[PDB]
């Protein structure tokens, strides 16, 4: 009941609809703390086998702390604009370097592992304690001091309790202090769920985020922030989905050319506005780089930093490309090469020249042969399409597709006065150039 | 049009050496893998060897491993098979064939050459033994009388017999040669002529033997009994 | 003996040949299963030291299972085309969600570890079992009631047998159920080699794949597929190399300009068809984004999804750029900037303006000074080339180079009627524009 598709023969493009939106509009920052110990070199000049292992595990811990201390020391995608991804978390850490902000956090978390702390600038952030190495080292490892270990399971327990810090240090070291995909070492799944549960958002947003934690991880940041006194702190910057559950639709385009027998003398045309389209508030967000949108079943996650704001009239380009309300963007060329585009529920085949183009399924083999021009085939009884030397697999999603017939628009142009090398043109701009060229030729 | 033409076949004693060749035209030679397939007289087909487009991988049958060597030259569009230590059971027609495939399960031989015959026989080249076979009363009367010549003890197979220098073609029947345990062949030809025409029609049996240049002719006339 | 190079002075380009092909033309899918346990939280109790470690390990196992359960829910590169990479494996999983498929796979693997199972749609897939945690847990971790552990090596054994599942869960969690480079946790070398050995292909293809396992890994996929009853299943999508051992060559191009002393008044020209070319069944496969072809010694691994099908006559552009059979593609400009291109066996230097361009070796230092224009130097006695403020190291691979002299073609053009800007033109298009411009020049 969800996904449908339509192919337009006039323009050689297809539209997929039936998807739902989840657009990241803002950021949410939280502070994660780890309590450290102040172990100083002990004498304990033993020779036991377990003492040596304990010493090695303490050396690893101290080297990790030193390394962390050293870490902090004093088409159409060209129209988008550039932002700064981690500005908010960096601002939070810039605040945390102030005089009493670490003390405030330390004194507000001693009784509980979660709390809301008001910073000196008035902003209140979630602070959450994930690991307590101070307690296990000060007590139960240096009892008031275990200089001759009598149990082997002490070594194993200490090794288990130390892996988290080493893994975090490694991840921060190989990334210069900023890890885009937030690993389960930085935040476990239970901790991430507990953190989502405390955001001041609606229950619908919480349900959307709780069922897609793998996307939330993929769209998050972790920033190494500070390590002073006996506290390790880093900021986690989570996505905020301000717009959810609105209709979304994808556009696929392929070149459209004439089919003259002579090798040259052929003109081509292509729509350049392929991408994802979602309507949020009385307008449409357009994402030219469809690689920047994650898809889970019929839910699309897109980032507004990589979008343009367009009027709702843009949708008229699919129904009629010559409408006066909106000017559709195209590209003209003179090189006709065969290729294929795999859509949501089928494939578009532009087969030109002397290439051999076919569609097949596993049981019966070839079940269609394509002629020169642009054509479409549904995935209902087709498994693969082969264009020249290339073989493609079609998606096997369930849905209905519709074929719309019409005369290709490249036949309405006169090749004599047709512009060719136009990368960033449109319908009106091509018409103006054609009109000027045609009006010039009236000499007498 | 795609063409594969084999050459270099001939007779060779056991333990000898030989080299067959196959020259292709009509397609890009260096894009395909090539094969050798042989068939013994009256027997089935058998794959011999293969070579990929750039000689990187090579395969042999277990019956010829260590004795045959496949090669190709992409600039000349030719591939070769070097045969060494030839045995009696290596006597067959050798074909060159081009590989066709679908990438995963299917592998076949669509285009085949025409074949080149290789004979491995210990016998030594010898001249044919020609004798006449005059008609007799037992083999006469009826409707017509038959008379012919006999060729005996000749090693190379291609023996050709013409009666009146090619001026007699009706009633002439030639029989296939017989392979004796000694390795020599022997074939007899018979001609049918009217019984009442006996003596009036001249019968001569020309035996032309290229490998021994033995071009002999022998008259067949009745000789009492 | 293997690979040679040739430099053409007329066009300022070089060709390297002697390479051998390995082109991915299809996919092969397999199913990997892990026999899992359904341990209930029915342990009696414990306050020991060795029992607490076992309980922690069991908690890790159960958390991993829950996480997995939550995971599954419901120039010239612009001419290429769009395919879908993991369509076949996704189709295999879509089939695998049917009613009796999992039971069928379970019944076919109880007595062995490998098997070929024919699914409901008729396709026969290869299934393989890599780990059996159920057996170990059931027959060695529930001795009828685990309330007291008598050995420490049981803890070590259990935590050794559990690492494989945790490492798979982490990988799938940070990738949203699709990991492109298949690691040794998903498939070991022994398992991958056996899987290659079971494929219905020739022995030549198996020899090619067995000696280049790292490339096979780099070109594979792994898709989280299903976890129900007591089976964990994922699909592994392996490359199929249908074309092997054909000749391949590489093309390098650099801008070609005039050398007037005035700031402007200089016209440039560049061939745009860089990349890899390979012979494919009577035609040529061209890969423009040469960054997507892996090279091992003299073997090139290219993916056919990123290629165009061209006639064999394309090779004529190297020997003669003005031939009538094929129309070579160029670009034109007026910005002449110095740069260098490192080839297989040398370097092309385009040195223009007031820049200083030299070549040197470690023992003797500078051994050549370039003048204005395009030039080539072999790597026999050259270690580095420096252009302006940049220094390059040349490749020190063995081979033979050849220098072909000729007049640069940019000198045959008249700058007055030269088309200054042409990103996607060809020789014929530039010629036809020059003919136009020159015809309009008529008096009275």
Coordinates of C-alpha atoms in Angstrom, one line a residue, chain C:
Chain C
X1 CA 59.1 -8.0 -20.1
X2 CA 55.6 -7.2 -19.0
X3 CA 54.6 -3.5 -19.2
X4 CA 55.9 -0.7 -21.5
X5 CA 55.0 3.0 -21.9
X6 CA 54.8 5.4 -24.8
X7 CA 54.7 9.2 -24.7
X8 CA 53.1 11.2 -27.5
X9 CA 54.5 14.7 -27.9
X10 CA 51.8 15.9 -30.3
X11 CA 49.0 15.5 -27.7
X12 CA 51.0 15.5 -24.4
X13 CA 49.7 12.1 -23.3
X14 CA 51.1 8.7 -22.4
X15 CA 49.8 5.1 -22.6
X16 CA 50.9 2.2 -20.4
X17 CA 50.2 -1.3 -21.6
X18 CA 51.0 -4.9 -20.5
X19 CA 48.3 -5.3 -17.8
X20 CA 45.9 -8.2 -17.5
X21 CA 42.2 -7.9 -16.8
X22 CA 39.9 -9.2 -14.0
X23 CA 36.5 -7.7 -14.5
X24 CA 33.6 -8.2 -12.0
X25 CA 30.5 -9.0 -14.1
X26 CA 28.2 -10.7 -11.6
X27 CA 27.5 -11.6 -8.0
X28 CA 27.4 -14.8 -6.0
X29 CA 25.4 -15.0 -2.8
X30 CA 25.8 -17.3 0.2
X31 CA 24.1 -17.7 3.6
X32 CA 26.1 -17.8 6.8
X33 CA 24.4 -19.2 9.9
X34 CA 25.3 -19.2 13.6
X35 CA 23.5 -21.7 15.9
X36 CA 22.3 -19.7 18.9
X37 CA 20.9 -20.4 22.4
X38 CA 17.8 -19.3 24.2
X39 CA 19.1 -19.3 27.8
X40 CA 16.5 -18.0 30.2
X41 CA 17.3 -15.9 33.2
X42 CA 16.7 -18.9 35.5
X43 CA 20.1 -19.2 37.2
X44 CA 19.7 -20.1 41.0
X45 CA 21.9 -17.4 42.7
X46 CA 25.5 -16.8 43.6
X47 CA 27.9 -14.6 45.6
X48 CA 31.2 -16.2 44.4
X49 CA 34.0 -14.7 42.4
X50 CA 34.2 -17.1 39.5
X51 CA 30.4 -17.2 39.2
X52 CA 30.1 -13.4 38.8
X53 CA 32.4 -13.5 35.8
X54 CA 30.2 -16.1 34.1
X55 CA 27.1 -14.0 34.8
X56 CA 28.8 -11.0 33.2
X57 CA 29.6 -13.0 30.1
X58 CA 26.0 -14.3 29.9
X59 CA 24.8 -10.7 30.2
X60 CA 27.0 -9.7 27.4
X61 CA 25.7 -12.6 25.2
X62 CA 22.1 -11.7 25.9
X63 CA 22.6 -8.0 25.3
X64 CA 24.2 -8.8 22.0
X65 CA 21.3 -11.0 21.0
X66 CA 18.8 -8.3 22.0
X67 CA 20.8 -5.7 20.0
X68 CA 20.7 -7.9 16.9
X69 CA 17.0 -8.5 17.3
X70 CA 16.4 -4.8 17.6
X71 CA 18.6 -4.1 14.5
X72 CA 16.2 -5.8 12.0
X73 CA 12.9 -4.0 11.6
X74 CA 10.5 -2.7 8.8
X75 CA 36.3 14.0 -16.3
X76 CA 33.6 12.0 -18.1
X77 CA 32.4 10.3 -14.9
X78 CA 29.0 12.1 -15.3
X79 CA 28.1 9.9 -18.3
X80 CA 28.0 6.6 -16.4
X81 CA 24.6 5.6 -15.1
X82 CA 23.2 4.5 -11.7
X83 CA 23.0 0.9 -10.5
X84 CA 22.0 -0.7 -7.1
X85 CA 24.9 -2.5 -5.5
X86 CA 23.2 -4.9 -3.1
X87 CA 20.0 -5.7 -4.9
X88 CA 20.7 -9.4 -5.2
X89 CA 21.6 -10.1 -1.6
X90 CA 18.6 -8.0 -0.5
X91 CA 16.4 -10.2 -2.7
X92 CA 17.9 -13.3 -1.2
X93 CA 17.0 -12.0 2.3
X94 CA 13.6 -11.0 1.1
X95 CA 13.0 -14.6 0.1
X96 CA 14.6 -15.9 3.3
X97 CA 11.8 -14.2 5.4
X98 CA 9.2 -16.7 4.2
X99 CA 7.6 -19.3 6.3
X100 CA 9.6 -22.5 6.1
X101 CA 12.9 -21.3 4.8
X102 CA 14.7 -21.1 8.2
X103 CA 13.5 -24.5 9.2
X104 CA 14.6 -25.9 5.9
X105 CA 18.1 -24.5 6.4
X106 CA 18.2 -25.8 10.0
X107 CA 17.2 -29.3 8.9
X108 CA 19.9 -29.4 6.2
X109 CA 22.9 -28.4 8.4
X110 CA 22.4 -30.4 11.6
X111 CA 24.7 -33.2 10.5
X112 CA 27.2 -31.2 8.5
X113 CA 28.6 -27.7 8.1
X114 CA 28.1 -27.1 4.4
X115 CA 25.1 -27.7 2.2
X116 CA 23.2 -26.6 -0.9
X117 CA 19.6 -25.8 -0.1
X118 CA 16.9 -25.1 -2.8
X119 CA 14.6 -22.3 -1.6
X120 CA 10.9 -21.9 -2.3
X121 CA 11.6 -19.8 -5.5
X122 CA 13.8 -22.6 -7.0
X123 CA 17.2 -20.9 -6.6
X124 CA 19.7 -23.1 -4.8
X125 CA 21.9 -21.3 -2.3
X126 CA 25.1 -22.4 -0.5
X127 CA 24.7 -22.4 3.3
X128 CA 27.6 -22.6 5.8
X129 CA 27.7 -22.8 9.6
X130 CA 30.6 -20.9 11.2
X131 CA 29.9 -21.0 15.0
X132 CA 27.9 -23.2 17.5
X133 CA 27.4 -21.4 20.8
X134 CA 24.2 -23.4 21.6
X135 CA 26.1 -26.6 21.8
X136 CA 28.8 -25.2 24.1
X137 CA 26.4 -23.4 26.4
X138 CA 23.9 -26.3 26.7
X139 CA 26.4 -29.1 27.2
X140 CA 29.1 -27.4 29.3
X141 CA 27.6 -24.3 31.0
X142 CA 24.4 -25.8 32.5
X143 CA 25.6 -28.9 34.4
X144 CA 22.5 -30.2 36.2
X145 CA 22.6 -25.9 38.3
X146 CA 25.8 -23.9 37.7
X147 CA 25.5 -22.3 41.1
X148 CA 29.2 -23.0 41.8
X149 CA 32.1 -23.0 39.3
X150 CA 35.1 -25.2 40.2
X151 CA 37.6 -24.1 37.5
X152 CA 38.9 -20.8 36.1
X153 CA 39.7 -22.1 32.6
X154 CA 35.9 -22.5 32.0
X155 CA 35.6 -18.7 32.3
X156 CA 38.4 -18.2 29.8
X157 CA 37.0 -20.7 27.4
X158 CA 33.6 -19.1 27.5
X159 CA 34.9 -15.6 27.0
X160 CA 37.0 -16.9 24.1
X161 CA 34.0 -18.5 22.4
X162 CA 32.0 -15.3 22.8
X163 CA 34.2 -12.7 21.1
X164 CA 33.2 -13.7 17.5
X165 CA 29.5 -12.8 18.2
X166 CA 30.3 -9.5 20.0
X167 CA 32.7 -8.4 17.2
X168 CA 30.0 -9.2 14.5
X169 CA 27.3 -7.4 16.5
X170 CA 29.6 -4.3 16.8
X171 CA 30.4 -4.3 13.1
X172 CA 26.7 -4.5 12.1
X173 CA 25.7 -1.9 14.7
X174 CA 28.1 0.8 13.4
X175 CA 27.1 0.2 9.8
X176 CA 23.3 -0.3 9.9
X177 CA 23.4 -3.9 8.9
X178 CA 25.6 -3.6 5.7
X179 CA 29.4 -3.8 5.9
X180 CA 31.2 -3.3 2.5
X181 CA 34.7 -4.6 3.3
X182 CA 34.1 -8.1 4.6
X183 CA 36.4 -8.7 7.6
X184 CA 37.9 -11.8 9.1
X185 CA 35.2 -11.9 11.9
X186 CA 32.5 -12.4 9.3
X187 CA 34.5 -14.9 7.2
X188 CA 37.9 -16.4 8.0
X189 CA 40.4 -17.2 5.2
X190 CA 39.7 -20.9 5.5
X191 CA 36.0 -20.4 5.2
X192 CA 36.4 -17.9 2.2
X193 CA 38.7 -20.4 0.5
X194 CA 36.3 -23.3 0.9
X195 CA 33.5 -21.1 -0.3
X196 CA 35.5 -20.2 -3.4
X197 CA 36.3 -23.9 -3.9
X198 CA 32.5 -24.8 -3.8
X199 CA 31.5 -22.3 -6.5
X200 CA 30.5 -23.7 -9.9
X201 CA 33.2 -22.0 -12.0
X202 CA 36.3 -23.1 -13.9
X203 CA 39.6 -23.9 -12.2
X204 CA 41.2 -20.8 -13.8
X205 CA 38.7 -18.5 -12.0
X206 CA 39.4 -20.4 -8.8
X207 CA 43.1 -19.9 -9.2
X208 CA 42.6 -16.2 -9.8
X209 CA 40.4 -15.8 -6.8
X210 CA 42.5 -17.9 -4.4
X211 CA 45.7 -15.9 -5.0
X212 CA 44.0 -12.5 -4.5
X213 CA 41.8 -13.0 -1.4
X214 CA 42.4 -9.5 -0.2
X215 CA 40.9 -8.0 -3.4
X216 CA 37.9 -10.4 -3.1
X217 CA 37.4 -9.1 0.4
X218 CA 37.6 -5.5 -0.7
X219 CA 34.9 -6.1 -3.4
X220 CA 32.4 -8.0 -1.2
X221 CA 29.3 -7.1 0.9
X222 CA 27.8 -8.6 4.0
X223 CA 24.1 -8.0 4.8
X224 CA 22.4 -8.6 8.1
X225 CA 19.5 -10.8 7.1
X226 CA 17.5 -12.4 9.9
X227 CA 17.6 -13.8 13.5
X228 CA 14.6 -16.0 14.5
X229 CA 14.1 -19.2 16.5
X230 CA 17.8 -20.2 17.5
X231 CA 19.5 -19.1 14.2
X232 CA 21.4 -16.0 13.2
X233 CA 21.7 -15.6 9.5
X234 CA 23.4 -13.0 7.2
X235 CA 24.2 -13.0 3.5
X236 CA 27.6 -12.6 1.9
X237 CA 27.7 -11.2 -1.6
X238 CA 30.9 -12.2 -3.5
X239 CA 32.2 -10.8 -6.8
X240 CA 32.1 -12.9 -10.0
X241 CA 34.9 -12.4 -12.5
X242 CA 33.4 -13.4 -15.8
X243 CA 36.2 -11.9 -17.9
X244 CA 39.9 -12.6 -17.1
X245 CA 43.3 -12.4 -18.6
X246 CA 42.6 -9.9 -21.4
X247 CA 44.9 -7.0 -22.4
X248 CA 44.4 -3.7 -20.5
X249 CA 46.1 -0.3 -20.8
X250 CA 46.0 3.1 -19.0
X251 CA 45.9 6.6 -20.5
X252 CA 47.4 9.7 -18.9
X253 CA 46.8 13.3 -20.2
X254 CA 48.1 16.8 -19.4
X255 CA 47.1 20.2 -20.6
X256 CA 48.7 21.5 -23.8
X257 CA 49.1 25.3 -24.3
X258 CA 50.9 27.9 -26.3
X259 CA 53.9 29.7 -25.0
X260 CA 53.4 33.4 -25.7
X261 CA 55.3 35.7 -23.4
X262 CA 52.3 38.0 -22.8
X263 CA 50.1 37.4 -19.8
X264 CA 47.1 36.4 -21.8
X265 CA 46.7 35.5 -25.5
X266 CA 47.4 31.8 -24.7
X267 CA 45.1 29.0 -25.6
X268 CA 45.0 25.5 -24.0
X269 CA 43.8 22.0 -24.9
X270 CA 43.5 18.8 -23.0
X271 CA 42.3 15.3 -23.7
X272 CA 39.5 14.3 -21.3
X273 CA 39.4 10.5 -21.7
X274 CA 41.7 9.4 -18.9
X275 CA 41.3 6.1 -17.3
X276 CA 41.6 2.3 -17.8
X277 CA 40.7 0.5 -21.1
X278 CA 40.2 -3.3 -21.3
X279 CA 39.3 -5.7 -24.1
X280 CA 35.8 -7.2 -23.7
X281 CA 34.5 -9.6 -26.3
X282 CA 35.1 -7.6 -29.4
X283 CA 34.7 -4.1 -27.8
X284 CA 36.3 -2.0 -25.1
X285 CA 35.3 -1.2 -21.5
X286 CA 36.3 2.2 -20.4
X287 CA 36.5 3.2 -16.7
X288 CA 36.8 7.0 -16.3
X289 CA 37.1 7.2 -12.5
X290 CA 40.3 5.2 -12.6
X291 CA 40.3 5.4 -8.7
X292 CA 37.8 2.5 -8.7
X293 CA 40.2 -0.1 -10.2
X294 CA 42.5 -2.0 -7.9
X295 CA 45.9 -3.1 -9.2
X296 CA 47.9 -6.1 -8.0
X297 CA 51.3 -6.3 -9.8
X298 CA 50.2 -6.5 -13.5
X299 CA 46.5 -7.5 -12.7
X300 CA 43.7 -4.9 -12.8
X301 CA 40.5 -5.5 -11.0
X302 CA 37.7 -3.2 -12.4
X303 CA 34.0 -3.1 -11.7
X304 CA 31.8 -3.1 -14.8
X305 CA 29.1 -1.0 -13.1
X306 CA 31.4 2.0 -13.6
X307 CA 32.2 1.6 -17.3
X308 CA 31.1 2.6 -20.7
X309 CA 31.0 0.3 -23.8
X310 CA 33.1 1.7 -26.7
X311 CA 34.0 0.5 -30.1
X312 CA 37.5 -0.9 -30.7
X313 CA 38.2 2.1 -33.0
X314 CA 38.7 4.3 -29.9
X315 CA 42.3 3.2 -29.8
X316 CA 43.0 5.2 -33.0
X317 CA 43.0 8.4 -31.0
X318 CA 46.4 7.5 -29.5
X319 CA 48.1 7.0 -32.9
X320 CA 46.3 9.8 -34.8
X321 CA 43.9 12.3 -33.2
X322 CA 42.6 13.6 -36.6
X323 CA 41.5 10.2 -37.9
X324 CA 38.0 10.1 -39.4
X325 CA 36.9 6.7 -38.0
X326 CA 36.6 8.0 -34.4
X327 CA 36.0 11.5 -32.9
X328 CA 38.3 12.1 -29.9
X329 CA 37.1 14.1 -26.9
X330 CA 39.0 17.2 -25.7
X331 CA 38.5 20.4 -23.6
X332 CA 39.6 23.9 -24.3
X333 CA 40.5 26.8 -22.0
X334 CA 42.7 29.9 -21.6
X335 CA 44.2 29.2 -18.1
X336 CA 47.7 27.9 -18.4
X337 CA 49.1 26.6 -15.1
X338 CA 52.1 24.4 -14.5
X339 CA 51.5 20.9 -13.1
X340 CA 52.9 17.3 -13.3
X341 CA 51.4 13.9 -13.9
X342 CA 53.1 10.7 -12.6
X343 CA 52.7 7.8 -15.0
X344 CA 53.6 4.1 -14.6
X345 CA 57.2 4.5 -15.8
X346 CA 57.8 8.3 -15.7
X347 CA 56.4 11.7 -15.4
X348 CA 54.8 14.3 -17.8
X349 CA 55.7 17.9 -17.0
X350 CA 53.6 20.8 -18.3
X351 CA 55.7 23.9 -17.4
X352 CA 54.3 27.3 -18.3
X353 CA 54.8 30.9 -17.3
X354 CA 57.6 31.9 -14.9
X355 CA 57.6 28.6 -13.0
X356 CA 60.8 26.6 -12.4
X357 CA 60.6 22.9 -13.3
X358 CA 63.4 20.4 -12.8
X359 CA 64.2 16.7 -12.3
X360 CA 66.8 15.2 -9.9
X361 CA 68.2 12.0 -8.4
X362 CA 69.7 11.4 -4.9
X363 CA 73.3 10.8 -6.0
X364 CA 73.8 13.6 -8.5
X365 CA 71.0 16.1 -7.8
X366 CA 69.4 18.1 -10.6
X367 CA 70.0 16.4 -13.9
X368 CA 67.5 18.2 -16.1
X369 CA 65.8 21.6 -16.4
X370 CA 62.5 21.8 -18.3
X371 CA 61.7 24.7 -20.7
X372 CA 58.2 26.0 -21.6
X373 CA 55.8 23.4 -23.0
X374 CA 55.0 19.7 -22.4
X375 CA 57.8 17.2 -21.8
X376 CA 58.3 13.7 -20.5
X377 CA 61.1 12.1 -18.5
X378 CA 61.7 8.4 -17.8
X379 CA 62.3 6.9 -14.4
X380 CA 65.6 5.1 -15.3
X381 CA 67.7 7.8 -13.6
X382 CA 65.2 10.1 -12.1
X383 CA 63.9 9.9 -8.5
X384 CA 61.9 13.2 -8.2
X385 CA 60.5 16.0 -10.2
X386 CA 59.7 19.4 -8.7
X387 CA 57.3 21.9 -10.3
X388 CA 57.1 25.3 -8.6
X389 CA 56.7 24.6 -4.9
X390 CA 55.7 21.0 -5.2
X391 CA 57.9 17.8 -5.3
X392 CA 56.9 14.4 -6.6
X393 CA 58.3 11.0 -6.3
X394 CA 58.2 8.9 -9.5
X395 CA 57.2 5.2 -9.4
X396 CA 60.3 3.0 -9.5
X397 CA 58.6 0.0 -11.3
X398 CA 60.6 -1.8 -14.1
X399 CA 59.8 -1.4 -17.8
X400 CA 60.6 0.2 -21.1
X401 CA 59.7 3.7 -22.2
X402 CA 59.5 5.2 -25.7
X403 CA 59.5 8.8 -26.8
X404 CA 57.5 9.7 -29.9
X405 CA 58.2 13.1 -31.4
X406 CA 55.7 15.3 -33.1
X407 CA 54.4 18.9 -33.5
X408 CA 51.9 19.8 -30.8
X409 CA 48.4 20.2 -32.3
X410 CA 47.7 23.5 -30.5
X411 CA 49.9 25.2 -33.0
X412 CA 47.6 24.4 -35.9
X413 CA 44.8 26.6 -34.6
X414 CA 44.2 30.3 -35.2
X415 CA 43.7 32.0 -31.8
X416 CA 41.4 34.7 -33.2
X417 CA 38.5 32.3 -33.9
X418 CA 39.5 29.7 -31.3
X419 CA 36.6 28.5 -29.1
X420 CA 37.8 29.5 -25.7
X421 CA 35.5 27.5 -23.5
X422 CA 34.5 23.9 -24.3
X423 CA 34.2 21.4 -21.3
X424 CA 32.6 18.5 -23.2
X425 CA 33.4 19.1 -26.8
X426 CA 35.3 17.0 -29.4
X427 CA 37.6 17.5 -32.4
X428 CA 34.7 17.7 -34.8
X429 CA 32.7 20.1 -32.7
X430 CA 35.6 22.5 -32.3
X431 CA 36.3 22.2 -36.0
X432 CA 32.6 22.9 -36.9
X433 CA 32.6 26.0 -34.5
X434 CA 35.8 27.3 -36.1
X435 CA 34.3 26.8 -39.6
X436 CA 31.2 28.8 -38.5
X437 CA 33.0 31.6 -37.0
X438 CA 35.3 31.9 -40.0
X439 CA 32.4 31.8 -42.5
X440 CA 30.5 34.8 -41.0
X441 CA 33.6 37.0 -41.7
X442 CA 32.3 38.3 -45.1
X443 CA 32.5 42.1 -46.2
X444 CA 29.6 44.0 -47.9

